[PDB]
Structures are given as structure tokens and as C-alpha cells.
Amino acid sequence: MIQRTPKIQVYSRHPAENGKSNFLNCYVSGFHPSDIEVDLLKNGERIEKVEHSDLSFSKDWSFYLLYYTEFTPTEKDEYACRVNHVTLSQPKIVKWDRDM
């Protein structure tokens, strides 16, 4: 029995440009088992239109997934990714920073 806590990365597909369409990606990896819940948040509100890749795993058996949605960046709205896994007591939140 092995349990691994997920690594999270919130970033955009292209350099964030206020006003134009882009994609908000939340990459979760290095976790085990596969059960995981990921939500893309906009000002704390959950975004209903979220798509994701198919479950796959790396050399070390750790699973990885990419959740994404098309959005329009603007320095007034706070975007974040909420992830819940068996290894987490409370859902971990990672804020989006257009500089990372």
C-alpha cells in the first residue's frame, strides 16, 4: 500500500495577456492512488466548464492529470486550483500567478 501526495501547478498555456482568451491549466502529478478531485476556482467560485486529460502514469507509477478551461485573464479576478486527495485532510488551494 502506497500513498503519495499530489504536486500542483496552476499556469496558463500562453503568457497571460489581460483581455485576450487563454487557457488556465492545473497540472496535478506524483500522486497515488488515482482518486482525486480538482476544481478550477474564479474568485472562490467553482468553474463548471472544466475539461481534463485521461489518467496516465509515469515511470514511478505516480499518476498525473491536467485540468483546463478557456478563460480571459484580468488582474481583478483571482484564479486558483483546489485539489482534494486521500493524503490531504483539507483541500489544498494553489493560487494562479501569471509570472509562474
Partner: protein, 277 residues
């Protein structure tokens, strides 16, 4: 090798959540081309790459048949392991298996793969000779016996050396312009002040393929490895990858730092710096 094809199988026993689920994804290097999920509305093999869509209905029915059968076969496998480890029907369990073949320069098989894992740990694996196994523990020894009696190794060797290589070549041909062309990264450095004494120099590499890449920050030539914050290569979402390397440097002195980028899609390694503007 030059190119590789891999299949990642994930079978999971989920007590209460439902009957054993089976997922299968196919890759040619860093590109996913197929997917099967015995839990979706219509359990069928679906395309994940444009170039694979040119295959006729026969191909799809073929993949779907195999996968549907695999779903049942894996349910048995899960139960068998449960018994092997004297486990109850109360806890979730996952079996993972990776199949794959590496294409050598001569167009023939360079190396074959087949390894399985139970609950995140190695269980059984086919050896480099493609004729013997390696059991992680006594429970895996049982599987090894079954597989030896059923001549599974020989069956797999045939696949890896033949069918795998054959189809890998077909796929590579079909998606020639995407799978055989390496995309160089778009690079640029950004300056982010943290305090009136220090600033972070972040070197970016976006839209590159394949994922393999090397980013390095240098100060007057010396590699600042010990102070470089490097993130794990991440998917851009459009079949390309991105990655960055940052280093915290003192104000003013930043002009002494250069970023070194290495990627196969580049004739030679790049060397850029931050241009104040």
C-alpha cells in the same frame, strides 16, 4: 530509442464506488493517440491524435474488442492478487501495467518493456532478454508460475519484436510531420523584483516538443545549479510542453546572468539574458 510506443493500463477495484474499472492510454513518444475507459457512457476506443483518425472502422473495433476483454481479465487479476495477499473486499486496490517497444536506428526492435505494479509498488516485470520474469515477492512468484506455464513471455516477445514495431512504424508514418519534427522552445527572460536588494530572473521555455529539455542559469560562466529553482516540465494542453528556471540575484548584478537552453530541436544550445525595457 529514436521513437517509442507505450500503453499504460490502470485497473482499479473500487469497493462501493462500482465494479472494477479499466483505463488504457496509448502513446507514441510524448503524444497520446488512443484512450479507452470502461466507465464512460459508451465504452469504446477513442482517438486522441489527429493522425490516428485516418484508420478505418476495422482498427477501432479491433482495439475495442481487446480492451473490453481486458476489462474482464483484469477483474479476475484484481481478485487473484487480493487472495495472494490475503486481502479483504473492503479496500480499494490498483493494478498498473506498462507495455512498450523502442525503435532502434535500424528500424528494428531496440528494447521491449512489460512491467506491472500492485498498489504503487513493483509486482512482476519482464526482463531485458524478453524471455524471463522478475517477481518482486512470493505472491508475484505465483503469477510467474502461471505465466511461465502459459508461455506469456514468448507471446509478449512476439508482440514487442513484431506487432509493436510494425504498428509503431505505421503510426510514425501517418503522423510524420508532428511525431518526427522536434519543436524548439520559444524563450524569454522575465524580471521580478522581490525586494529593494534582490530580484528573481525567470527563464522561460514554452511550446517545445518533445518534453526533454535542459535549462540552466549561469553567472559569469559558472553554473548556478545550487541556487536555481526548477519546476517540473508541464503540458501546455496543446500537445507541447513548457518549463521555467528562476534564480534570485542581487539588484544591479543581474547583468552577469545568462540562461542556457538545451533541446534537440535546436542546432546548438541557446544563451539569452534579461533585456531591460
Amino acid at each position: 530509442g529514436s521513437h517509442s510506443m507505450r500503453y499504460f493500463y490502470t485497473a482499479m477495484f473500487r469497493p462501493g464506488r462500482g465494479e472494477p474499472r479499466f483505463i488504457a492510454v496509448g502513446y507514441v513518444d510524448d503524444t497520446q493517440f488512443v484512450r479507452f475507459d470502461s466507465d464512460a457512457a459508451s465504452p469504446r476506443t477513442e482517438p486522441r491524435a489527429p493522425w490516428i483518425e485516418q484508420e478505418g472502422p476495422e482498427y477501432w473495433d479491433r482495439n475495442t474488442q481487446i480492451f473490453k476483454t481486458n476489462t474482464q481479465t483484469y477483474r479476475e487479476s484484481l481478485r487473484n492478487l487480493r487472495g495472494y495477499y490475503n486481502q479483504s473486499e473492503a479496500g480499494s486496490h490498483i493494478i498498473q501495467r506498462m507495455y512498450g517497444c523502442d525503435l532502434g536506428p535500424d528500424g528494428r526492435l531496440l528494447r521491449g518493456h512489460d512491467q506491472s505494479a500492485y498498489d504503487g509498488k513493483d509486482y512482476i516485470a519482464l526482463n531485458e532478454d524478453l524471455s524471463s520474469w522478475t517477481a518482486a515477492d512470493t505472491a508475484a512468484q505465483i503469477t510467474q508460475r502461471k505465466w511461465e506455464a502459459a508461455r506469456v513471455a514468448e507471446q509478449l516477445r512476439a508482440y514487442l519484436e513484431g506487432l509493436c514495431v510494425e504498428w509503431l512504424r505505421r503510426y510514425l508514418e501517418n503522423g510524420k510531420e508532428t511525431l518526427q519534427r522536434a519543436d524548439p522552445p520559444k524563450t524569454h527572460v522575465t524580471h521580478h523584483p522581490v525586494s529593494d536588494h534582490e530580484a528573481t530572473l525567470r527563464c522561460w521555455a514554452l511550446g517545445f516538443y518533445p518534453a526533454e529539455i535542459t535549462l540552466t542559469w549561469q553567472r559569469d560562466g559558472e553554473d548556478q545549479t545550487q541556487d536555481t529553482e526548477l519546476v517540473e516540465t508541464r503540458p501546455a494542453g496543446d500537445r507541447t510542453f513548457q518549463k521555467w528556471a528562476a534564480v534570485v540575484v542581487p539588484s544591479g548584478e543581474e547583468q552577469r546572468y545568462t540562461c542556457h537552453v538545451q533541446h534537440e530541436g535546436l542546432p546548438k544550445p541557446l544563451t539569452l539574458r534579461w533585456e531591460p525595457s
